[PDB]
Design a protein around this ligand. Sequence first.
Ligand SMILES: *[C@@H]1O[C@H](CO)[C@@H](O)[C@H](O)[C@H]1NC(C)=O
Ligand SMILES: *[C@@H]1O[C@H](CO)[C@@H](O)[C@H](O)[C@H]1NC(C)=O
Lengths: 50, 25
Amino acid sequence: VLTESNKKFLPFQQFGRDIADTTDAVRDPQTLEILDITPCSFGGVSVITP
Amino acid sequence: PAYTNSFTRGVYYPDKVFRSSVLHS
Ligand SMILES: *[C@@H]1O[C@H](CO)[C@@H](O)[C@H](O)[C@H]1NC(C)=O
Ligand SMILES: *[C@@H]1O[C@H](CO)[C@@H](O)[C@H](O)[C@H]1NC(C)=O
């Protein structure tokens, strides 16, 4: 999921690998804006019965 | 001649990657 971000990259930097060498922020090559990246959704399903 | 000590000079950015508040080797 691409969302807005508040972090400020250096002028020559492109993307971020802060934790575990995983990309989470990518500079837009056109508008020169930084967009956050996050996987959309995943999880389990539980059923409650009496 | 006349060799000179270079204490902590000659370090650059190895990659075009943003990292904040993390120690990287
Ligand atoms: C790329 O082109 C668009 C449309 O002309 C313009 O709005 C944008 O500023 C340009 N970006 C760069 C980095 O030149
Ligand atoms: C530079 O090299 C000489 C010998 O080639 C050595 O004696 C000297 O200690 C060196 N410089 C430094 C700052 O260690």
